[PDB]
Design a binder for this molecule. Structure first.
Ligand SMILES: CC(=O)N[C@H]1[C@@H](OP(=O)(O)OP(=O)(O)OC[C@H]2O[C@@H](n3ccc(=O)[nH]c3=O)[C@H](O)[C@@H]2O)O[C@H](CO)[C@H](O)[C@@H]1O
Ligand SMILES: CC(=O)N[C@H]1[C@@H](OP(=O)(O)OP(=O)(O)OC[C@H]2O[C@@H](n3ccc(=O)[nH]c3=O)[C@H](O)[C@@H]2O)O[C@H](CO)[C@H](O)[C@@H]1O
Ligand SMILES: O=c1ccn([C@@H]2O[C@H](COP(=O)(O)OP(=O)(O)O)[C@@H](O)[C@H]2O)c(=O)[nH]1
Ligand SMILES: O=c1ccn([C@@H]2O[C@H](COP(=O)(O)OP(=O)(O)O)[C@@H](O)[C@H]2O)c(=O)[nH]1
Ligand SMILES: [Mn+2]
Ligand SMILES: [Mn+2]
Ligand SMILES: [Mn+2]
Ligand SMILES: [Mn+2]
Lengths: 601, 591
């Protein structure tokens, strides 16, 4: 032999090539994998303690957490000016002019206080769409965008309009989705209060066939009067017809309009939605790689979620789908890791467009202990992950080593930058990660073969979890054991705002991270505590009591005053919670002391 | 019952009003101003020195400044982008036959970069869609349309630019038939340096005799057709004469004057940075010229390309002053003065607990020999009432604008105050200090005398927190970059070009002190400085600094210099010649 890349990854690339590597080889490598990721994290010393420090004030109560990952009421509380100009409404159209007409009519009948433009988006229609639009030029503040015919390009056309949209609030409407008179108002009135929430309107099905667009401009309510169509469903051999309905509405009333749902994107359907345009630049636009089978909605909604955008249902946004003359799970799979992606076995397992996990690593001068650091994650029971490193202007071979090692690794990705400190390094690396579950791994340390896996099981139990940390063992730079890391048994916010109990190896929901101000780039240290204190405000944490992190154990007078300094700021900075009646002051005037006192002000 | 604002402004807010003020009420106000501003800055002590620090390494030569504010070659040297392609927004209004010919010419483009054609239709009566729809199987053509609500050129240009999907855009009046090497000539340059906007030359020709089809088969006809006389010996792009003297503008200092939305190409990033086209316009110009100005102010460069020739087809039987002070603005007197929309000058004041000395500050800016000036104050999360003072003082002032943010250092307040300013000439004014009534004028003069000039600065005399004049401020007789890179010789009052600033990284929001020395150092690289040897600044002198902080002060200092490691200097390090903390003596260690 000589040198190489992990077997974990080796197998996936093999399972990929349509030309089967000889079983004899494949097996030999799989085994080598199985044995290198065989050890199991060893549980830790079972302790016993005071959940919420007694010293903790009995008049102080941190702002209650959110009741789910999409709880927008709680998001509303989070205090923290905007321009409420108008609502650019994009209507994707492929022929059906006589219908776009009706939809344009029901858009003339809008009783709202907001300015709204209608952007008819034509994706290479055959019928003459511009003819229609011109007819309305005298009623709506209408615009027309067109792209040539090159297939089914809804995502592409959706993008044109949204691009053409001039306001800060966009809305999307299939050309067959006739809004009700209160559509604009309903969306806008909510987008004006919270712009971090993507309103989703419901729908009903109507056979608008017996009418022309004139009937609607006339009867400015006719749209709410036309009977919902009926469906001839086949139930076990014999026919059963019922009133076709929006399958989502049932779910809407059972989640308080998705305020409690932990997977709102499952209901996001671009045929009638509204949101702040800023999100397009944050989570991207509709994926044009999607064919007519769909998935683009969920996949888009997912990325909205992964950034921190919320989801909400509006009844005032009811749209009417005009009657046109199964296995979605296999469509997301690749681009939506979170809820949908299920584990494959190394044998049949294969690389993923978007990894389920992203191990970020801030690296500065971690010369020799960095190739050990990266393989400690590439060699994990969870094969569906990636490693993103950020060279913080190392003054040593670090970066050079990363290249002659990972410059072509399908599962590793780095980025160099001029040294800006540890707070930054991270932001840069985290931003590099494309996965939903994100863990921390410093340069000189290294993990345990099932660290990531162990955390992953905890996220799956409570999809409300924002973070999950394990415990660690203090290690010799050389690699020798010399202690077991501090391990506070149970997690609670109070204990956190009293002492840094988030032992190392941490894992957080990218969405949760995005709901935070990110890493603090102006402090020499206390970076971890800050980030994780910030996280505690976003959601609950879960601690596993096993040793999954091997940490190297690596104080000149003046310095110290900084450390003490930083530590207390962090807790104070947590004024974010709108807490001003107290203050976490030191109790002593010593450097290495951490004893604190809740002095009132 | 009496109590109000200030003079100069008072008048301006009048000369504007539509009710003739009793010349009496007025007059006195005018004397107020005159005597309140009739003072002039006394010359500064005369010193004799040696221009370049005699310690300057012979083998150290500072990278040469640009030859003109728009020297894109220099810019080029200084120092992965996604070169997706070109988005060509073609503003259309009928002339459907001409469009067809133009589109036909874009079909014959010989280039390697990918491109798209967005037809921006501003209320055409004719069937533009038909023409677009015709060129579908030849061009990636998108077609956008807005209703006829008048002459909305800018409007439509923006609609299209918004619809652009690539990182590079281009505009071409519906009748501007591009030459075969157009798209290429632009991308070629755009891919190497996206901080320079490309201006294309034109030619007027007769097109009626043809049909868009001719140009499709005769891929080389638009070049053979004869120039005519549009409404010498024929009609010629007046700009072309200038394009060959200024070395394609590389030497021009008012490049925004040759900017046409009929034939240009630039990095879309600019729309997002200098603003889009100003829809507040009517039937003619100003836009091309005003948008270009803004670009200019945001550090953009203008370079006329030749290969981007375009042919202006002949039609069938068919304002600025407010927003542009750098060139056109005319220093007009007070009694007939006014409030210009876009100001010519802006004064930024980082504020932090200056409650006791702030009104005295802001005021002085207004009470200047200059009328077209503004003040942009940024309260850096003051603890005291600073903010309230400002509020109930200028919360309505038609020449003052302020803002609040949690205290984050001086390097931040600046980057925020300056980022707030709207004028072209920016001057620094510290809260507790106060300027002389003619300092914005003096500086303003020097700038008039030279446009290569990036910054002009005077000198000052120190003051007692209260007002008692203490000692006269330091003064280096003559400027030079080599000197500033050896010790802060850039005294206080300091005015620099908005553009200059924009060519820099702004203030350092990470250093307790030296910020000042870091900006004018960052600036000294972008352009030349002029030094007015007259006292125009009165700065308070606040006392006792305990050793510890004095330990970082000297630290920052040196860092600032070295930090000017952007000049690509790798062999020298500006180190100390003493471990003492308040010492500033240096040595050039050859590394
Ligand atoms: C009520 C509902 O479940 N609506 C969704 C459903 O559409 P539907 O299954 O209701 O079919 P549909 O034809 O109404 O959806 C087509 C929508 O896409 C447009 N179109 C169609 C063909 C074309 O070549 N270009 C084009 O832009 C057309 O303008 C219309 O707005 O499934 C789609 C999957 O893509 C979208 O997620 C729709 O929002
Ligand atoms: C190459 C050139 O010399 N261009 C400038 C010159 O054009 P011209 O004097 O040649 O004016 P023009 O008749 O070519 O019209 C200018 C452009 O505006 C468009 N248009 C016209 C009327 C309308 O209601 N909507 C509309 O979009 C039209 O398609 C054309 O693209 O002077 C104008 C003053 O405003 C513009 O600065 C043009 O950029
Ligand atoms: O300017 C820096 C300094 C440190 N680090 C990294 O931040 C982590 C923590 O710092 P270090 O090991 O030096 O001490 P630690 O902070 O680990 O206790 C390690 O990844 C360092 O490699 C960094 O990215 N940039
Ligand atoms: O946290 C601060 C501290 C000061 N300043 C402003 O910084 C400028 C210079 O501050 P300082 O007084 O320290 O500078 P000096 O007056 O000492 O030159 C003054 O206008 C202050 O009002 C600020 O914006 N933020
Ligand atoms: Mn449909
Ligand atoms: Mn370490
Ligand atoms: Mn013209
Ligand atoms: Mn001061």
């Amino acid at each position: 032999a000589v040198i190489d890349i992990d077997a974990a990854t080796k197998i996936m690339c093999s399972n990929a090539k349509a030309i089967s590597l000889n079983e004899v080889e494949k097996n030999e490598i799989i085994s080598k994998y199985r044995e290198i990721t065989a050890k199991k994290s060893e549980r830790a010393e079972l302790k016993e303690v005071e959940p919420i420090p007694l010293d903790w004030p009995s008049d102080l109560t941190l702002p209650p957490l959110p009741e789910s990952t999409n709880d927008y009421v709680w998001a509303g509380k989070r205090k923290e000016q905007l321009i409420i100009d108008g609502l650019s409404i994009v209507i994707p159209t492929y022929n059906r002019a006589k219908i776009l007409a009706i939809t344009l009519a029901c858009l003339c009948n809008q009783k709202t206080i907001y300015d709204y433009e209608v952007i008819v988006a034509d994706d290479g229609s055959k019928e003459n769409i511009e003819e229609i639009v011109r007819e309305f030029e005298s009623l709506l503040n209408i615009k027309y965008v067109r792209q040539k015919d090159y297939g089914y390009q809804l995502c592409a056309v959706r993008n044109l309009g949204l691009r053409a949209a001039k306001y800060n609030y966009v809305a999307i409407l299939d050309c067959d989705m006739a809004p009700n008179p209160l559509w604009v108002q309903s969306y806008m009135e909510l987008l004006a209060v919270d712009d971090n929430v993507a309103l989703i309107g419901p729908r009903k099905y109507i056979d608008t066939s017996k009418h022309t667009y004139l009937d609607f401009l006339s009867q400015k309510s006719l749209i709410n009067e036309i009977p919902e169509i009926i469906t001839n469903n086949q139930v076990a051999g014999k026919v059963e017809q019922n009133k076709s309905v929006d399958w989502r509405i049932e779910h809407f009333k059972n989640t308080d309009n998705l305020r409690l749902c932990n997977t709102p994107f499952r209901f996001f359907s671009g045929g009638n939605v509204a949101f702040a345009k800023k999100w397009l630049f944050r989570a991207g636009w509709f994926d044009e790689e999607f064919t007519h089978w769909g998935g683009e909605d969920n996949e888009f909604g997912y990325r909205l979620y992964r950034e921190g955008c919320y989801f909400r249902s509006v009844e005032g946004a009811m749209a009417y789908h005009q009657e046109p003359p199964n296995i979605t799970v296999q469509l997301l799979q690749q681009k939506v890791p979170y809820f949908y992606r299920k584990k494959e076995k190394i044998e049949s397992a294969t690389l993923k467009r978007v990894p389920l996990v992203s191990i970020y690593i801030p690296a500065y001068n971690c010369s020799k202990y960095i190739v050990r650091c990266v393989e400690s994650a590439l060699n994990q029971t969870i094969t569906d992950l990636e490693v993103c490193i950020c060279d913080d202007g190392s003054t040593d071979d670090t970066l050079r080593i990363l290249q002659e090692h990972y410059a072509n690794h399908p599962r590793v990705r780095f980025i160099s930058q001029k040294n800006k400190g540890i707070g930054s390094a991270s932001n840069t690396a985290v931003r590099l990660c494309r996965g939903f579950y994100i863990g921390q791994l410093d340069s000189d340390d290294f993990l345990e073969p099932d660290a990531v896996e162990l955390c992953l099981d905890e996220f799956r139990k409570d999809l409300s979890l924002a973070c999950v940390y394990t415990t660690n063992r203090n290690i010799d730079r050389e690699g020798n054991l010399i202690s077991n890391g501090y391990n506070w048994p149970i997690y609670s916010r109070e204990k956190l705002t009293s002492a840094m109990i988030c032992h190392h190896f941490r894992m957080f929901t990218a969405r949760a991270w995005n709901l935070t101000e990110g890493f603090n780039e102006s402090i020499s240290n206390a970076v971890d505590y800050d980030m994780y204190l910030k996280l505690s405000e976003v959601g609950p944490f879960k601690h596993i009591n096993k040793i999954c992190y091997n940490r190297v154990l690596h104080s000149i007078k003046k310095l110290d005053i900084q450390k003490e300094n930083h530590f207390k700021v962090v807790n104070e900075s947590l004024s974010r919670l709108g807490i001003k009646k107290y203050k976490y002051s030191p109790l002593t005037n010593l450097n290495e002391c951490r004893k604190y006192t809740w002095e009132k002000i």
